[PDB]
Amino acid sequence: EPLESQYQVGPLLGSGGFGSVYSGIRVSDNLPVAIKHVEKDRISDWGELRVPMEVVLLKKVSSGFSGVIRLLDWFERPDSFVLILERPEPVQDLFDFITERGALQEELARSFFWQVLEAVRHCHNCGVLHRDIKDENILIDLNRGELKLIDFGSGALLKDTVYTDFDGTRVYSPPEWIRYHRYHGRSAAVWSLGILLYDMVCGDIPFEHDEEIIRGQVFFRQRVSSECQHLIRWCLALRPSDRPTFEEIQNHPWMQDVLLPQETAEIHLH
Ligand SMILES: O=C(Nc1cnccc1O[C@H]1CCNC1)c1csc(-c2c(F)cccc2F)n1
Numbered sequence: 001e002p003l004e005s006q007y008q009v010g011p012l013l014g015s016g017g018f019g020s021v022y023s024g025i026r027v028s029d030n031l032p033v034a035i036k037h038v039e040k041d042r043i044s045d046w047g048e049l050r051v052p053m054e055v056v057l058l059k060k061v062s063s064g065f066s067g068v069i070r071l072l073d074w075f076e077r078p079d080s081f082v083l084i085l086e087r088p089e090p091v092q093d094l095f096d097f098i099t100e101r102g103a104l105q106e107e108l109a110r111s112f113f114w115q116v117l118e119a120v121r122h123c124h125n126c127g128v129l130h131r132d133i134k135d136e137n138i139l140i141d142l143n144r145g146e147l148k149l150i151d152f153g154s155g156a157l158l159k160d161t162v163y164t165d166f167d168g169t170r171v172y173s174p175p176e177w178i179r180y181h182r183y184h185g186r187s188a189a190v191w192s193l194g195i196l197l198y199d200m201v202c203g204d205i206p207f208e209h210d211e212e213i214i215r216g217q218v219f220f221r222q223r224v225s226s227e228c229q230h231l232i233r234w235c236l237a238l239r240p241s242d243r244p245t246f247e248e249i250q251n252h253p254w255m256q257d258v259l260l261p262q263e264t265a266e267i268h269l270h
Helices: 052-061 094-101 106-124 175-180 185-202 212-215 225-236 245-251 261-269
Strands: 007-018 019-024 032-039 072-076 078-086 090-093 138-141 146-149
Touching: 007 175, 019 052, 019 225, 052 072, 052 078, 078 094, 090 094, 094 138, 094 185, 106 138, 106 146, 106 185, 106 245, 185 225, 185 245
Parallel strands: none
Antiparallel strands: 007 019, 019 032, 032 078, 072 078, 090 138, 138 146
């Protein structure tokens, strides 16, 4: 029951706005894990089963489907919570992967983007809005060609009314947030997915400054097919209601004939 006695702690994987995250092994069966610490003073969103809203969201999405890193257990300490999360091995985040490869071939980006869409749909089906979809928050299980979302620490319960709070990543945030401090969940998620898909096929994000986000003119700095460009620009429609639904994204001509994850690993990752 001590954290100490169930887990051998390994080295730090990263720290930041979300807390500090370490590699670990579960002693009972040697299962690789990740161990995330969050200081209670740093938590502003709370929920109940009293825990961080992050733990509520995780428990909602962690019933089995493999497109999210699951919450395996958690602990409360006097000044912090400790979350025990899945750890694939070998693994690499998508930011690192794109940094190393540069812009992804479209077949690969299609496979990755499709898996992200399936994972986001799973979250929304479980009643969870992630609100920080980006390269750094997507892990690639390199052996199986499977992508997995991490970091629910800026997420919220999914609702149909306006959100007036945001603490995700600004350059992935939509023009309605920038201009009005208001957004709806789904259409804000589709904007972020447009930013993400551009990042995959171009190797960097399309917008740095607020003025570029609100102008929403997309320039392509690498060669990208016309169908991919069209999907990106649709996702990045300035008016929220002009963006595609997940169903419309997944029916788009660019999204046809996706590789399976295992095929994807055999072709592009092995
Ligand atoms: O939940 C996860 N991670 C996380 C959560 N909540 C906030 C941040 C999180 O991650 C931080 C560490 C890596 N960058 C961000 C997680 C599980 S496995 C893992 C991971 C890995 F096993 C190898 C390399 C990088 C990894 F991310 N991460």
